[PDB]
């Protein structure tokens, strides 16, 4: 918990969540090659139920969901991946991110599993619609809406 | 007809499990002999059931059909894979 | 008008929200109206430009419903004879007005509070807590 | 299933319904739901009337057509029928 | 068990109280001193909100109470571009 | 008719359209028999997913599908 | 904890059983239609473990279920239970 509310973030923006559902986190060539294996599910929920910010945001722009559902081993590590995406989901993830790309976890999802337990977990609202509609059709929602949900359509 | 249907489950489960150990083996050795083979294959497999060498014979022949394991030019005897 | 962030008074509109929550957490009557209209009210003070009145809103509430307290722990005092009694009743009044204001504060307790502090159904019986019973505690206790 | 949106004047309703139904129950519904006695209900749907003993999937509109984000208008009237007088929503406010 | 739903322009939108409980604004609305309507209509007036709108984010609770379990696919929900924006408020306000 | 009361048994399995790999006839979830002692996982077009090594070895063989007469193509 | 009132009509217990641990399979072509007075339950409990634990699915075993009958035209003498 101390460490996770300093937010520590990597040159490339990854908080200390982003790389524990990574594939590409470099674990060095000696010894902890063995035990230590990421995307990990139980150092993903370790780091959820310590205070870790589920909506954190790379500096590229996916979340900690964009990045586990473009996990290219799924059906061999299904229990992994399972895992992850259900303690992000009802840990506070928001299954309708958009990077700075504009693409949700579906649009950057690499694989057909990982689109099958996104939408499983993906809970429909009305805000998320409605923000959906306001991004795609280029409205200028600058000065009309509440300063809260500038934010939220920020993130569609 | 249950306890048949059970008593061939475990004949081609033990069919499976020569195959898986006779790649095993020749993976971690990438050469040996019928001979050897053989016995090092009823070695392995002893927790389990007690193969016949008929099973095991059957199960390295079919394996070269699929490529996991090939006989060397030199003779039949010694084994190799591709 | 519609949902757009006005730029509202926050005199008048807290007024007519101090009437409507003291007539709530004591249980009395207000209109359906009246209140499905303090909704929009309490909507227009946490989102209004040039600043959001949420943190204010919050504070007033917070400061309303210490003075509330207080003023319910005097009165218990001044019945010593039937403390018990009063502090029973006056507990099952502002319990349910403290839910009630739970309900009637829902976007402040998810649009402000949660994005630290504590939601107003948390706030009053924290409020509750600290100046009704924990006070008078050895007289309940005793009695 | 079938979903409709029930218009008499400002009075809107919106009410699920089965395909293998009469306007029987449609009318039942809406004047459970409306309190009023259960024969002044005429529908319009699309100002033509319909018969009070014919199912609603053949009135017109069927289960791909009627669907939940967009349900298929259905006026209504009472006796004093009244004239058809559908208010129209809010117009919204020009372009994004 | 039918709530009906007071829009600012006069419309009354009825429909079905599970339908409007997945809004939490509703669901705080009928919690309470809005409860003490009774009269099985339970209604809530929307000073805010325009009937285009309210008429949208009523089909919302259609859509959603019917596609919730979404066993194979649930269809996309027709957001005009006009009503956008307006409907994006509305659905802040209502929590939906 | 009607039941009072009722007893069912239920066999939950994942929701993965492919369920084992018909090359070592073994489940994808563990390592294939060339694998298991020392994997990713294969797809096609026509909804073939085996193991990576499996499916390297056959289409070394031939390029055919294990269960039907298809042209295999990657993903 | 649902909404609506869930009116079951049945105490519902079942064995949810991992299919590759157990050695039950779906060997019969039997095409056995679900009883629709307890359709009802099969389906809230197929929402359930959507709901609960998802990203599994259920193949129903239709020949190890049993449970109790009523028999409104044979007499009701007592009651009866068998399989499904
Ligand atoms: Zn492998
Ligand atoms: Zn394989
Ligand atoms: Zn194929």
Same mark, same amino acid.
């Given at each position: 918990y101390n460490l996770i509310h300093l937010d520590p973030r990597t040159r490339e923006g990854f908080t200390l969540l982003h790389l524990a559902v990574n594939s590409n986190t470099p674990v060095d060539d000696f010894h902890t090659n063995d035990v230590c294996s990421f995307p990990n599910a139980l150092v993903t929920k370790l780091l959820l139920d310590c205070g870790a910010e589920v909506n954190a945001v790379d500096n590229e722009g996916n979340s900690a969901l964009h990045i586990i559902v473009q996990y290219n081993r799924p059906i061999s590590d299904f229990l992994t991946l399972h895992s992850i995406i259900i303690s992000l989901v009802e840990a506070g993830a928001h299954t309708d991110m958009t990077n700075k790309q504009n693409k949700t976890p579906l649009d950057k999802s690499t694989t057909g599993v990982s689109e099958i337990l996104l939408k499983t977990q993906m809970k429909m609202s009305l805000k998320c619609l409605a923000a959906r509609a306001v991004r795609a059709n280029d409205i200028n929602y600058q000065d009309q809406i509440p300063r809260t949900l500038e934010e939220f359509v920020g993130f569609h | 007809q249950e306890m048949e249907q059970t008593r061939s489950a475990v004949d081609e489960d033990r069919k499976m499990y020569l195959q898986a150990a006779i790649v095993r083996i020749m993976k971690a050795r990438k050469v040996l002999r019928h001979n050897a083979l053989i016995q090092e294959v009823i070695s392995q497999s002893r927790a389990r059931f007690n193969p016949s060498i008929s099973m095991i014979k059957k199960c390295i022949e079919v394996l070269i059909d699929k490529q996991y394991i090939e006989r060397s030019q030199a003779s039949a005897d010694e084994y190799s894979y591709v | 008008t519609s949902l757009k962030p006005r730029?509202? =008074?926050?005199?008048? !509109?807290?007024? @007519?929200?101090? !009437? !409507?929550? /003291?007539? +709530?957490?004591?249980? *009395?009557?207000?209109?359906?109206?009246?209140?499905? =209209?303090?909704?929009?009210?309490?909507?227009?003070? $946490? +989102?209004?430009?040039? *600043?959001?009145?949420?943190? #204010?809103?919050? !504070?007033?509430? @917070?400061?309303?419903?210490?003075?509330? +307290? #207080?003023?319910?722990?005097? #009165?218990?005092? *001044?019945?010593?004879?039937?403390?018990?009694?009063?502090?029973? %009743?006056?507990?099952?009044?502002?319990? @349910?007005?403290? =839910?009630?204001? =739970? $309900?009637?504060?829902?976007?402040?307790?998810?649009?402000?509070?949660? /994005?630290?502090?504590?939601?107003?159904?948390?706030?009053?019986?924290?409020?509750? %807590?600290?100046?009704? +019973? *924990?006070?008078?505690?050895?007289?309940?206790? #005793?009695? | 299933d079938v979903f409709l949106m029930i218009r008499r004047h400002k009075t809107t309703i919106f009410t699920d319904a089965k395909e293998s139904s009469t306007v029987f129950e449609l009318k039942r519904i809406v004047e459970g739901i409306l309190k009023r006695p259960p024969d002044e209900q005429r529908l319009y749907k699309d100002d033509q009337l319909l018969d009070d003993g014919k199912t609603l999937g053949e009135c017109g509109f069927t289960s791909q057509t009627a669907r939940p984000q967009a349900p298929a208008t259905v006026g209504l009237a009472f006796r004093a029928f009244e004239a058809l007088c559908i208010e129209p929503f809010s117009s919204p406010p020009e372009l994004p | 068990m039918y709530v009906k739903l007071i829009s600012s322009d006069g419309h009354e939108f009825i429909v079905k109280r599970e339908h409007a409980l997945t809004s939490g604004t509703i669901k705080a609305m009928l919690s309470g001193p809005g409860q003490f309507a009774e009269n099985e209509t339970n209604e809530v007036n929307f000073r805010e909100i325009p009937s285009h709108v309210l008429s949208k984010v009523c089909m919302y609770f259609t859509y959603k109470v019917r596609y919730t379990n979404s066993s194979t696919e649930i269809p996309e929900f027709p957001i005009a571009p006009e009503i956008a924006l307006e409907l994006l408020m509305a659905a802040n306000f209502l929590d939906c | 008719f009607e039941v009072k009361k009722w007893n069912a048994v239920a066999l939950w399995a994942w929701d993965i359209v492919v369920d084992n790999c018909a090359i070592c006839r073994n489940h994808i979830m563990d390592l294939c028999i060339e694998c298991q002692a020392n994997c990713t996982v294969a797809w096609g077009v026509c909804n073939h997913a085996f193991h990576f090594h499996c499916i390297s070895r056959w289409l070394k063989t031939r390029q055919v599908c294990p269960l039907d007469n298809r042209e295999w193509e990657f993903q | 904890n649902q909404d609506t009132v869930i009116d079951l009509g049945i105490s519902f217990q079942i064995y949810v059983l991992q299919a590759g641990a157990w050695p039950l399979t779906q060997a019969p072509s039997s095409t056995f239609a679900i009883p629709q007075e307890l359709e009802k339950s099969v389906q809230m409990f197929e929402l359930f473990y959507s709901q609960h634990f998802s990203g599994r699915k259920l193949t129903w075993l239709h020949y190890l279920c049993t449970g109790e009958v009523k028999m409104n035209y044979l007499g009701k003498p007592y009651v009866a239970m068998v399989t499904t």
């Open positions: - | - | 730029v509202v =008074d926050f005199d008048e !509109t807290w007024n @007519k929200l101090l !009437t !409507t929550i /003291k007539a +709530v957490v004591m249980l *009395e009557y207000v209109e359906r109206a009246t209140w499905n =209209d303090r909704f929009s009210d309490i909507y227009a003070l $946490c +989102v209004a430009y040039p *600043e959001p009145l949420g943190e #204010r809103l919050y !504070t007033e509430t @917070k400061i309303f419903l210490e003075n509330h +307290v #207080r003023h319910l722990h005097k #009165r218990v005092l *001044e019945s010593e004879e039937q403390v018990l009694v009063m502090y029973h %009743r006056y507990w099952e009044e502002y319990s @349910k007005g403290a =839910d009630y204001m =739970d $309900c009637l504060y829902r976007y402040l307790n998810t649009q402000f509070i949660k /994005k630290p502090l504590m939601e107003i159904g948390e706030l009053a019986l924290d409020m509750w %807590r600290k100046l009704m +019973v *924990e006070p008078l505690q050895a007289i309940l206790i #005793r009695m | - | - | - | -």
